[PDB]
Write a protein that binds this ligand. Structure first.
Ligand SMILES: Cc1cc2nc3c(=O)[nH]c(=O)nc-3n(C[C@H](O)[C@H](O)[C@H](O)COP(=O)(O)O)c2cc1C
Ligand SMILES: O=C(O)C1=C(C(=O)Nc2c(F)cc(-c3cccc(OC(F)(F)F)c3)cc2F)CCC1
Ligand SMILES: O=C(O)c1cc(=O)[nH]c(=O)[nH]1
Length: 364
């Protein structure tokens, strides 16, 4: 329980929990427990990384989606994450798609979800983050940054304005903002990844960002999908360097269904995450890193469940990594596991630290 044993959670607790609660109910309880600190390894200098104008004591963060409304930020740092990202958050509140909208594929160590941006909205999250704004300031100074993921409302008419509003309301409370334009569960959202659309969108976002006071000015990253054509990637890389985008989050869930999936629910509509997404995600990181000449910070996400998974993404070009689906299968202990294996792998491979491994595959 509080001891935090990897086998117990993986073999007994998590399985029992999922055998009694449906996916969504399990998630809601997860958020509750985390917010209350009902949770079960010391970071070494080796895991420290410096990017996006911040210090990160460890490169392992919790991907967007687990804490959509910023209700468990502190319980997440306590879980061992080097940084937390909340969202996606939409300007106005919205319920998202009807239940069921999340599905487990245990035989594939994967999950499929079609939430549709269920969100409390900017205001609610704004006040929720303001209530701990000073505490976060100290956490960030301590190497524990906060990122905020921005989405857009379903009935919105001006996609750009939606993100612009998010930048104005939550940008002052975040170390970095994420323009999420890769969600597969919102009609026409991914089309915003197009060159022309993306350029107009990011130009406005960055302008709103630059208009904020210095200490409240966040880095701006763009979260992309793993289903982009070689053309989309070239365009995104071009726009990113043209506008000075601070970084990229690679990748979101995939609408593809790799041959081999065994889960009974493999044909449910939605974005696929977990092991089946891992390598497709690592390859997207490898490609974007090269297209940006390794000058644009990348946060690798997609099927990370071990130190090896984390290091392959770092060697492919990621400065930081995130995980989510792995947490839903192995529980809280997975965080320490990934960090411990990552450290051992770095030493075992001759790297003085994480910073030394970033992009290493491209130099060999
Ligand atoms: C239930 C669920 C909800 C998610 N919600 C969001 C979201 O609101 N915004 C976002 O940018 N990504 C969201 N994601 C995507 C994750 O942040 C991540 O990009 C993806 O799942 C790959 O990581 P993983 O294999 O470790 O889960 C969600 C994923 C899941 C499984
Ligand atoms: O589970 C799923 O299918 C899905 C999601 C999910 O949110 N899972 C999930 C869960 F159920 C439980 C904990 C958890 C959190 C803290 C302590 C803990 O330990 C003890 F309970 F002991 F406190 C256990 C973490 C999780 F990540 C997202 C959609 C699919
Ligand atoms: O809320 C969602 O449907 C959602 C958003 C996103 O960016 N990715 C995902 O897999 N689901």
């Amino acid at each position: 329980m509080a001891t935090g044993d990897e086998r117990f959670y993986a073999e007994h607790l998590m399985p029992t929990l999922q055998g009694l609660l449906d996916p969504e109910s399990a998630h809601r309880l997860a958020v509750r427990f985390t917010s209350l600190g009902l949770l079960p390894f010391q970071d070494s200098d080796m895991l420290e990384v410096r990017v996006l104008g911040h210090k990160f004591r460890n490169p392992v963060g919790i991907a967007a989606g687990f804490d959509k409304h910023g209700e468990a930020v502190d319980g997440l740092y306590k879980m061992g994450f080097g940084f937390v990202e909340i969202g996606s958050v939409t300007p106005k509140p919205q319920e998202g798609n009807p239940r069921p909208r999340v599905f487990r594929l245990p035989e594939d160590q994967a999950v499929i979800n079609r939430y549709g941006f269920n969100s409390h909205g900017l205001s609610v999250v704004e006040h929720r983050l303001r209530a701990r704004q000073q505490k976060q300031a100290k956490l960030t100074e301590d190497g524990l940054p906060l990122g905020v993921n921005l989405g857009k409302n379903k009935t919105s008419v001006d996609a750009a304005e939606d993100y612009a509003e998010g930048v104005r309301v939550l940008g002052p409370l975040a170390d970095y903002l994420v323009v999420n334009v890769s969600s597969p569960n919102t009609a026409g959202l991914r089309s915003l990844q197009g060159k022309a659309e993306l350029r107009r969108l990011l130009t406005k976002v960055l302008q709103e960002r630059d208009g904020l006071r210095r200490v409240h000015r966040p880095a701006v990253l763009v979260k992309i999908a793993p289903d982009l054509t070689s053309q989309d990637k070239e365009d995104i890389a071009s726009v990113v360097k043209e506008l000075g985008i601070d970084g990229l989050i690679v990748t979101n869930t995939t609408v593809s269904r790799p041959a081999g999936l065994q889960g009974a629910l493999r044909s449910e509509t939605g974005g696929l995450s977990g092991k089946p997404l891992r390598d497709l995600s690592t390859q997207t990181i490898r490609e974007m890193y090269a297209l940006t000449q390794g000058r644009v910070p990348i946060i690798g996400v997609g099927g990370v469940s071990s130190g090896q998974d984390a290091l392959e993404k770092i060697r492919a070009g990621a400065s930081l990594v995130q995980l989510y689906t792995a947490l839903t299968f192995w529980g809280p202990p997975v965080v320490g596991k990934v960090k411990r294996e990552l450290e051992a792998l770095l030493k075992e491979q001759g790297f003085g630290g994480v910073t030394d491994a970033i992009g290493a595959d491209h130099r060999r």
